[PDB]
A paper describes a structure:
Type IA topoisomerases (TopoIAs) are present in all living organisms. They resolve DNA/RNA catenanes, knots and supercoils by breaking and rejoining single-stranded DNA/RNA segments and allowing the passage of another nucleic acid segment through the break. Topoisomerase III-β ([name]), the only RNA topoisomerase in metazoans, promotes R-loop disassembly and translation of mRNAs.
To study the structures of full-length [name]-[name] in the presence and absence of DNA, we purified the human [name](Y336F)-[name] heterodimer from HEK293T cells. We first obtained an apo form [name]-[name] map at ~3.1 Å resolution, which revealed the structure of [name] spanning amino acids 1–717, including half of its CTD (residues 612–717) as well as the N-terminal region of [name] (residues 1–190). The planar assembly of the protein complex exhibits substantial positively charged surface areas on one side, which may enhance its binding to nucleic acids. Three Zn2+-binding motifs within the CTD of [name] were well defined, but the fourth and fifth C-4 zinc fingers (residues 718–815), as predicted by AlphaFold (AlphaFold DB O95985), are too mobile to be captured. Different from Zinc finger or zinc finger-like motifs in E. coliTOP1 and MtbTOP1, our structure reveals that [name]’s CTD establishes intramolecular contacts with both the core and an extended loop (residues 168–190) of [name]. The [name]-[name] heterodimer is further stabilized by TOP3Bcore-[name] contacts involving hydrophobic interactions of the extended loop of [name] with two antiparallel [name] α-helices of domain IV.
Residue numbers in the entry:
A (entry chain B): 1 to 189
B (entry chain A): 0 to 717
């Protein structure tokens, strides 16, 4: 029952730990893999899960990530653009995806145009890698042929990601403040 | 008996030229009592009667606005009652000319007046000033018959002055009132602020001259762009990026230098893995070849903005100098009026005649002859603001009859005209894409098939490059070497005159060709220096002034209030606005802002003490800047400060205590290094961000309170 449900979960590709399944449950007499998927998508990957990523992927001694492995996005940075613009269209945008299993953090590079993943992707978004994915000199190579975005909505680290909005703080103009300069009302007719 | 008609021009040379054109040679002339203007007489026909003519000229503006005198003394006055309490009067505008008396004695007996002033908005002000000067001394007439006339024209040329005479109209009091409103607004706001600052800073600091401080509704906004460029230059953070370069051998000696599609990579490890993908490979496979025809469009008709931009960038002439040379060229009759914002030729224009005029100059001779032989191409459609036609040639000129910069400007204007009436430049763009390993590089080249306008404008010609090898798809080429580079991003350069022209045109500040006036004003007042390449480098005084203005009230620097005011002046011009209403509104808002400026001038006094006083700018180094990553000096004056020498800004710190560094930690919002505040007696000390204590990041927290109530989800110290 629960054990075969977890086995089907692993076959589908969500390598979770028995503690994780027991934490993500339903009425404790029958649980369905769809329910586990739905609960897990809303759950941060660090809280639950197991270790399937080898602890050598950043070393560079591996070149293969066989298996339908699900990971979580932690940070997105445009490496084709500098830290002051992040939007200059002088080079095709290429994304340095920081991905995690909750145990070991790996890095991937967008080797093509991945329309599903953008700079506005919320951290905690789950990405499934299928078929064969190639590691080289550290980073993974990701494209549309093996990466699928499985939604993702986890409130605590989306609220943490709201530090992106906090970063855009051009409000430091001292205009309209209570103890500030008088404002310029627009002209009438 | 024969009656008389009077004419007024803006310059004596224009008066003489128009009198010669209209009088068909027969023209008596004698000097006036002023010693600088001459009056010309002849006989012709007006309305339906044979009448005598009397044409004279003014010397630019005839009346200039100022105060009543008692309010003009800056030493003994309250420089806050100049807004809506101090009367204004147009006094004499160079009384050495005695223009009012000259006009009165000239029009002592007259029945008609026609005004040949420049057809710009500023010209109507002079038109109505001359009308005010001459109306009481003319004949009252029998009643109802039109007396005042207005001549509309764009070039001082034959049959153009004639058609200007054939369709006489009336002056525009709306344009006159717009000009008067602009003059009053400047003369009030700028003089009030300048007088207050001059009275405040006077002998206070050794290295600061009182008279060098000035404020203006346009000078400060146009200096804001230069100081903003300076701030970006001084607060630049260089970053290293890597570019892969591939060299391939075509047949035996030619080496194509391919460039990467990804252009740049800002990660050293990513660049290293991309090179590892490539350096072992010894072949390149061509994928796509494209030879597509493209056309480079002709330039639009020349307006004053583009003329000034080109005269600055290419001809090396300032905006005011270019404007004066263009006005002189118009005065002699070589070009049209160079105060035009229209880039579309009217349908009833003699383009073919203008081309036929310049059919003998050796430089552009074959091109003009072939254009006349074949069909004339229609100019590109553009903006049709309804002003004069674009700046176009009207008479043949040679370097011998012209001079230096004037001849250069005429040459550019004629070349632009020929380019406008011409054909597009056609070139084929050959692009070859190569695959090396998993990466794909490219190479591009341009081959000119038929030079069109890029024969009268050689500087716009498509650069010549050797043709790319003819390689079909699926061909293998040897690669010599592939290597990454360690390029670093470069800081922006200082704002050029052309870029300033573009910015002022975009933001709306500067209309009716007042941008050269503003630029020349901020250049004469030592706020910007014209360094090589026509670059406006802000000076210390200008940087400090604009930084203080930004600290006190941002709208005093940002180009918003001036843009709105100029828009309302334009609506004044187009008969839909109230002059009194707009003047009162602007005066009231600027009066409130001036009261706030007086009540909060302490912010500006601080940046001036640390900048223009050598005996009060020495302090111990302290926490880094947040824009410079440079040490900030901690001054021990009564208003304890924190001054950065790189970027001329100061930050206020609490008094009655001590300031100490807080373990090198850094604020996660402004990058500044936060310092602690020991409040005298033995007790708790709270962290304090130097930039947040002066500029709060959140609306709720006011100026001058530390991270105790920072009201920030981040900044753990809060
Ligand atoms: Mn004029
Ligand atoms: Zn600084
Ligand atoms: Zn801060
Ligand atoms: Zn804080």
């Amino acid at each position: 029952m629960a054990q075969v449900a977890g086995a089907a979960l692993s076959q589908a590709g969500w390598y979770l730990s028995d503690e994780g399944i027991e934490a993500c449950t339903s009425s404790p007499d029958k649980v369905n893999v769809n329910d586990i998927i739905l609960i897990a998508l809303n759950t941060d990957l660090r809280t639950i899960g197991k270790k399937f990523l080898p602890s050598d992927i950043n070393s560079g001694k591996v070149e293969k990530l066989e298996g339908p492995c699900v990971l979580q996005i932690q940070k997105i940075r445009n490496v084709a653009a500098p830290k002051d613009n992040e939007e200059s269209q002088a080079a095709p945008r290429m994304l340095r995806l920081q991905m995690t299993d909750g145990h070991i953090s790996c890095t991937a590079v967008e080797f093509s145009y991945m329309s599903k993943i953008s700079l506005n992707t919320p951290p905690g978004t789950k990405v499934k890698l299928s078929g064969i994915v190639d590691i080289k000199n550290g980073f993974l190579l990701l494209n549309d042929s093996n990466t699928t975005v499985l939604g993702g909505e986890v409130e605590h680290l989306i609220e943490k990601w709201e530090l992106q909005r906090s970063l855009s703080k051009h409000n430091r103009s001292n205009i309209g403040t209570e103890g500030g300069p008088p404002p310029f009302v627009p002209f009438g007719q | 008996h024969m009656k008389t008609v009077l004419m007024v021009a803006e310059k004596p040379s224009l008066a003489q030229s128009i009198a010669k054109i209209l009088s068909r040679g027969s023209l008596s002339s004698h000097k006036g009592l002023n010693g600088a203007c001459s009056v010309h007489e002849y006989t012709g026909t007006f309305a339906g009667q044979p009448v005598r003519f009397k044409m004279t000229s003014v010397c630019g503006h005839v009346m200039t606005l100022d105060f009543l005198g008692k309010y003009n003394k800056w030493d003994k006055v309250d420089p806050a009652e100049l807004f809506s309490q101090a009367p204004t009067e147009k006094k004499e505008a160079n009384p050495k000319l005695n223009m009012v008396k000259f006009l009165q004695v000239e029009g002592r007996g007259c029945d008609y007046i026609v005004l040949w002033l420049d057809c710009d908005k500023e010209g109507e002000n002079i038109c109505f000033e001359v009308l005010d000067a001459v109306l009481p001394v003319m004949n009252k007439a029998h009643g109802g018959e039109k007396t005042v006339f207005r001549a509309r024209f764009s070039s001082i040329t034959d049959t153009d002055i004639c058609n200007a005479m054939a369709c006489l109209g009336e002056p525009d009091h709306n344009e006159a009132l717009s000009v008067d409103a602009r003059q009053e607004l400047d003369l009030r706001i700028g003089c009030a602020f300048t007088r207050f600052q001059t009275k405040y800073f006077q002998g206070k600091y050794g290295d600061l001259d009182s008279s060098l401080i000035s404020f203006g509704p346009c000078q400060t906004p146009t200096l804001g762009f230069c100081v903003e460029r300076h701030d970006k230059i001084q607060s630049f953070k260089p970053e290293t990026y890597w570019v892969l370069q591939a060299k391939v051998n075509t047949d035996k000696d030619r080496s194509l230098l391919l460039d990467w599609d990804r252009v740049r990579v800002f990660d050293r490890e990513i660049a290293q893995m991309f090179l590892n993908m490539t350096k072992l490979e010894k072949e390149a496979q061509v994928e796509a070849t494209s030879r597509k025809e493209k056309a480079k469009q002709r330039p639009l008709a020349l307006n004053t903005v583009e003329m000034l931009r080109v005269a600055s960038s290419s001809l090396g002439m300032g905006p005011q100098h270019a404007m004066q040379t263009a006005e002189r060229l118009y005065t002699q009759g070589y070009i049209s009026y160079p105060r035009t914002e229209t880039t579309h030729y009217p349908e009833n224009f003699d383009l073919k005649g203008s081309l036929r005029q310049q059919a003998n100059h050796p430089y552009w001779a074959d091109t003009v002859k072939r254009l006349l032989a074949e069909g004339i191409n229609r100019p590109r459609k553009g903006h049709d603001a309804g002003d004069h036609p674009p700046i176009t040639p009207m008479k043949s000129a040679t370097e011998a009859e012209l001079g230096g910069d004037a001849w250069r400007l005429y040459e550019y204007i004629t070349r632009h005209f020929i380019a406008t009436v011409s054909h597009d430049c056609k070139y084929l763009q050959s692009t070859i894409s190569f695959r090396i390993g998993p990466e794909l590089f490219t190479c591009s080249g341009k081959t000119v098939l038929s030079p069109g306008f890029t024969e009268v404008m050689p500087w716009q010609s498509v650069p010549l490059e050797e043709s790319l090898p003819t390689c079909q798809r699926g061909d293998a080429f040897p690669v010599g070497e592939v290597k990454m580079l360690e390029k670093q991003t470069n800081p922006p350069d200082y704002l050029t005159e052309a870029e300033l022209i573009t910015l002022m045109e975009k933001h709306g500040i500067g209309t009716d060709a007042s941008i050269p006036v503003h630029i020349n004003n901020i250049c004469q007042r030592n706020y910007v220096t014209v360094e090589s390449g026509r670059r406006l480098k802000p000076t210390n005084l200008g940087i400090v002034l604009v930084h203080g203005y930004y600290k006190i009230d941002a709208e005093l620097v940002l180009p918003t209030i001036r843009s709105a005011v100029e828009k309302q002046l334009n609506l004044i011009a187009q008969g839909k606005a109230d002059y009194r209403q707009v003047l009162g509104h602007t005066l009231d808002v600027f009066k409130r802002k001036f009261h706030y400026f007086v009540d909060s001038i302490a912010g500006m006094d601080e940046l001036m003490e640390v900048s223009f006083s050598p005996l009060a700018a020495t302090g111990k180094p302290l926490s880094r800047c947040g824009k410079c990553h440079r040490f900030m000096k901690y001054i021990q004056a009564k208003p304890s400060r924190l001054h950065c020498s790189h970027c001329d800004e100061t930050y206020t710190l609490p008094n009655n205590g001590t300031i100490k560094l807080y373990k090198e930690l850094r604020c996660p919002l402004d990058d500044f290094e936060l310092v602690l505040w020991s409040s005298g007696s033995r007790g708790k000390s709270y962290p304090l961000c130097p930039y947040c204590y002066n500029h709060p990041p959140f609306r709720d927290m006011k100026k001058g309170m530390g991270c105790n109530e920072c009201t920030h989800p981040s900044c753990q110290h809060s």
